[PDB]
UniProtKB/Swiss-Prot annotation:
GO molecular function, one term: identical protein binding
PANTHER family: LYSOZYME C
Source organism of this protein record: Homo sapiens (Human)
Localization per Swiss-Prot or TrEMBL: Secreted
Protein name, entry field: Lysozyme C
Gene name in the database record: LYZ
Length: 130
């Protein structure tokens, strides 16, 4: 499922993402935008280390979910990576919350640093009623 911007903004707010571990809703929106373009079925194989990124937040199978094929991987979110490809983003969100509970926080995703950090990210939530 490819979410429309404001539809996603409202969904994330309802799932309690706004301000989670100090991360504003607009940062989560900027992250989803650059990681997958708000697409829940997006998957990306990283040939260099044999890991795959899954879903809307492109969560890495090496640490967060289990797909069985990633070498020396853990499943910190205790989910099958398949769960991160559903239209219903409840599991992807619960797992993203787990990722930011780590010391790096939102910085865990390099795309956030490159395209969201220290930028005016208001645009992602403007007009969405959140």
């Amino acid at each position: 499922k490819v979410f429309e911007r404001c539809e996603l903004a409202r969904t994330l707010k309802r799932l309690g993402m706004d301000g989670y571990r100090g991360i504003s809703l607009a940062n989560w929106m900027c992250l989803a935008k650059w990681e997958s373009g708000y697409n829940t079925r997006a998957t990306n194989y990283n040939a260099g280390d044999r890991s795959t990124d899954y879903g809307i937040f492109q969560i890495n199978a090496r640490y967060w979910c289990n797909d069985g094929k990633t070498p020396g991987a853990v499943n910190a979110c205790h989910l099958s990576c398949s769960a991160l490809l559903q239209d219903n983003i409840a599991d992807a969100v619960a797992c993203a919350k787990r990722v930011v509970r780590d010391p790096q926080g939102i910085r865990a995703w390099v795309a956030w640093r490159n395209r969201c950090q220290n930028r005016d990210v208001r645009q992602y939530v403007q007009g969405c009623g959140v």
